[PDB]
């Protein structure tokens, strides 16, 4: 061919921070790129166009279980190495890696807790949190927008939702990042799953203690809602409740964090727009839509073929692993003219940064509230947000994509 074998492993720092040119070349050669794996194994098909990505997350034929796909069984249900138990029992229990019917029942029991009406009555407390955070972060030496803002904001929001102390916000962040070392795009090199294993163990005990405490008080809070189901005839285990808690805690912030951080890098690289938001507050909602498609926090999601399927001009055999590049789709010229230009005026409801299909983002509404509000606080809270320079460090993560830390500078 012309361009080489494609995958998401082992990227250099500078391409992680700006992979769009990579997605562009490959996308221009072919909409799908097959990447074999060997002797009796499944190849991976990477989808780069918007239309194909939509089909992939739409198809009732692409599931989340590799072990269901292969008909094999010496195969893990979740992409977690068998030797690691705690880790593995917590990831198997994530709604995201679930297929109907189980997934349907769990999403339904959960979905009512993130309603537009609940989110609306939360906007005030989310605004108040963000402000107080910018206060502590301001009286500080070498402020880091991530650990000092983008990370604790959504953590405080989801933690109050679950029913756990805010005082643990830093402790929750640490373990979350440690656990995150298990996603498929990271190395397994030097200290692989090791840290993710210990992170899983701490969360299991931590949450186990919580659930064991339910029937003292009972407030409205996910933990109590869950344990209530189980005690009144609902079919779910502690391993189910525990994983669901970890799943929400992580799903509840790691994406919001990466979005907030990358939203700052984007605006600083587009001062005309950032200067627009500062002067015109109502533009925020529209801007959040663009910032979202321009540089989405989730660059890749995977599905598994449960029977043969034809995507693009390739036939994807039952058992294949399919990867939908959300970041590539969002910059597909076939659907977003001038994909590299930050244009807040283009029509919304097209960007797939929140996914699509039955696994669409459970807290999309909440997420969008934290983004609009959080961005606001930044725009109004840090006048020099777009001035001077900064220093950023991206993580070795192509799934949860975004800065590990983002430093700005003081007055």
Ligand X SMILES: O=C(O)c1[nH]c(C(=O)O)c(-c2c[nH]c3c(Cl)cccc23)c1-c1c[nH]c2c(Cl)cccc12
Which of these segments, 123-131, 162-170, 176-184, 263-271, binds ligand X (CB under 6 A)? Answer: 176-184
What, of ligand X, ligand HEM, none, does residue 246 touch, CB below 5 to 8 Å by kind?
A: none
DSSP H helical ranges for 100-191: 102-111, 116-120, 123-138, 152-162, 169-179
Task: For residue 311, list its beta bridge partners.
Answer: 314
Q: Binding residue for ligand HEM (CB under 6 A) from 31, 148, 240, 252?
A: 252
**Cβ contact 291:374 at 8 Å:** no
What, of ligand X, ligand HEM, none, does residue 371 touch, CB below 5 to 8 Å by kind?
A: ligand HEM
Q: Which is nearer to ligand X, 148 or 296 (CB)?
A: 296
16 vs 397: CA distance, rounded Å: 8
Residue 330 is a binding residue for ligand HEM (CB under 6 A): no
Q: Which is nearer to ligand HEM, 210 or 289 (CB)?
A: 289
Residue 401 is a binding residue for ligand HEM (CB under 6 A): no
Output the six-digit token pair for 347.
């029509």
Residue 76 is a binding residue for ligand X (CB under 6 A): no
Q: Which is nearer to ligand HEM, 196 or 329 (CB)?
A: 329
Residue list 111-170, contact with ligand HEM (CB under 6 A): 114, 154, 158
Closest listed residue to residue 149, CA positions, set 401, 389, 385:
385
Closest listed residue to residue 395, CA positions, set 145, 185, 91:
185
Residue 184 is a binding residue for ligand X (CB under 6 A): yes
Count of residues near ligand X by CB under 6 A: 15
Here's the x/- map for ligand HEM, 342-381, by CB under 6 A: it reads as: -----------xxx---x-xxx--xx---x----------
Q: Residues 356, 362, 365, 367: is their CA dihedral positive or negative?
A: negative
20 vs 341: CA distance, rounded Å: 12
Q: Which is nearer to ligand X, 91 or 155 (CB)?
A: 91
* Exposure on the CB side of residue 280, measured as CA atoms within 13 A: 11
What, of ligand HEM, ligand X, none, does residue 180 touch, CB below 5 to 8 Å by kind?
A: ligand X
Q: Binding residue for ligand X (CB under 6 A) from 342, 369, 395, 399?
A: 399
Phi, psi of 63 (to 5 degrees): -105, -170
Q: Binding residue for ligand X (CB under 6 A) from 35, 51, 79, 286?
A: 79
Q: Which is nearer to ligand X, 77 or 333 (CB)?
A: 77
Residue list 23-82, contact with ligand HEM (CB under 6 A): none
Q: At closest approach, how far in Å is the CB of 164 from ligand X?
A: 18
Residue 242's H or E segment, with its range, is helix 238-251
Residue 107, annotated as binding a ligand: yes
Output the six-digit token pair for 361.
């983002």
356 vs 303: CA distance, rounded Å: 12
Count of residues near ligand HEM by CB under 6 A: 27
What, of ligand X, ligand HEM, none, does residue 353 touch, CB below 5 to 8 Å by kind?
A: ligand HEM
Residue 8 is a binding residue for ligand X (CB under 6 A): no
Residue 183 is a binding residue for ligand X (CB under 6 A): yes
Phi, psi of 198 (to 5 degrees): -65, -35
Residue 298 is a binding residue for ligand HEM (CB under 6 A): yes
Residue 91 is a binding residue for ligand X (CB under 6 A): yes
Output the six-digit token pair for 227.
């344990």
Separation of first and last alpha carbons in the chain: 54
**What long-range pairs does 382-391 form, CB within 8 A, spacing at least 24?**
382/134, 382/138, 382/408, 384/408, 384/409, 384/411, 385/264, 385/267, 385/268, 385/274, 386/267, 386/268, 386/271, 386/274, 386/275, 390/265, 390/268
Which of these segments, 120-128, 169-177, 208-216, 244-252, binds ligand HEM (CB under 6 A)? Answer: 244-252
162 vs 35: CA distance, rounded Å: 40
Residue list 197-256, contact with ligand X (CB under 6 A): 251, 255
Closest listed residue to residue 279, CA positions, set 370, 377, 380:
380
Residues binding ligand HEM (CB under 6 A): 95-96, 107, 114, 154, 158, 248, 251-252, 255-256, 259, 296-298, 301, 326, 353-355, 359, 361-363, 366-367, 371
Binding residues for heme b: 64, 107, 303, 359, 361-362
Binding residues: 64, 107, 303, 359, 361-362
Residues binding ligand X (CB under 6 A): 79, 91, 96, 179-180, 182-184, 251, 255, 298, 301-302, 399-400
């Amino acid at each position: 061919a012309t361009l080489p074998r494609f995958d998401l492993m082992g990227w250099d720092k500078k391409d992680i921070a700006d992979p769009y040119p990579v997605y562009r070349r490959y996308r221009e050669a072919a909409p799908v790129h097959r990447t074999a794996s060997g002797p009796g194994k499944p190849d991976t098909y990477y989808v780069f166009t918007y239309d194909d990505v939509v089909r992939v997350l739409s198809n009732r034929r692409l599931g989340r279980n590799a072990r269901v796909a292969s008909g094999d069984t010496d195969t893990a249900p979740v992409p977690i190495p068998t030797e690691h138990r705690a880790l593995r029992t917590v990831v198997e229990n994530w709604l995201v890696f679930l297929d109907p019917p189980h997934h349907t029942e769990l999403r339904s029991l959960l979905t009512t807790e993130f309603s537009p009406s609940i989110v609306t009555g939360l906007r005030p407390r989310i605004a108040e949190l963000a402000s107080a955070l910018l206060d502590r972060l301001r009286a500080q030496r070498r402020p880091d927008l991530v650990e000092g803002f983008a990370a604790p904001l959504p953590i405080l929001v989801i933690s109050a939702l679950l029913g756990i102390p805010e005082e643990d916000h830093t402790w929750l962040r640490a373990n979350a990042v440690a656990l995150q070392e298990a996603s498929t795009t990271r190395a397994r090199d030097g200290r692989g799953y090791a840290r993710a294993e210990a992170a899983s163990q701490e969360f299991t005990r931590y949450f186990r203690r919580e659930v064991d405490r339910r029937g003292g008080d009972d407030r409205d809070d996910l933990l109590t809602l869950l344990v209530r189901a189980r005690d009144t005839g609902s079919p779910l285990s502690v391993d189910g409740i525990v994983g669901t808690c970890v799943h929400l805690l992580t799903a509840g912030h790691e994406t919001t964090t990466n979005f907030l951080a990358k939203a700052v890098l984007t605006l600083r690289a587009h001062r005309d727009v950032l200067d627009e938001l500062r002067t015109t507050p109502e533009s925020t909602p529209a801007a959040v839509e663009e910032l979202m498609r321009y540089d989405p926090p989730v660059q890749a999601v995977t599905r598994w073929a449960y029977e043969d399927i034809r995507l693009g001009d390739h036939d994807i055999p039952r058992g294949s692993r399919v990867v939908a590049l959300l970041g590539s789709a969002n910059r597909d010229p076939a659907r977003f003219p001038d994909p590299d230009v930050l244009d807040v005026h283009r029509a919304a409801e097209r960007q797939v940064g929140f996914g699509l299909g039955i696994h669409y983002c459970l807290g999309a509404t909440l997420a969008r509230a934290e983004a609009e509000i959080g961005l606001r606080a930044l725009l109004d809270g840090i006048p020099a947000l777009g001035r001077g320079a900064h220093e950023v460090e991206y993580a070795d993560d192509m799934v949860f994509h975004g800065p590990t830390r983002l430093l700005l500078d003081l007055p």
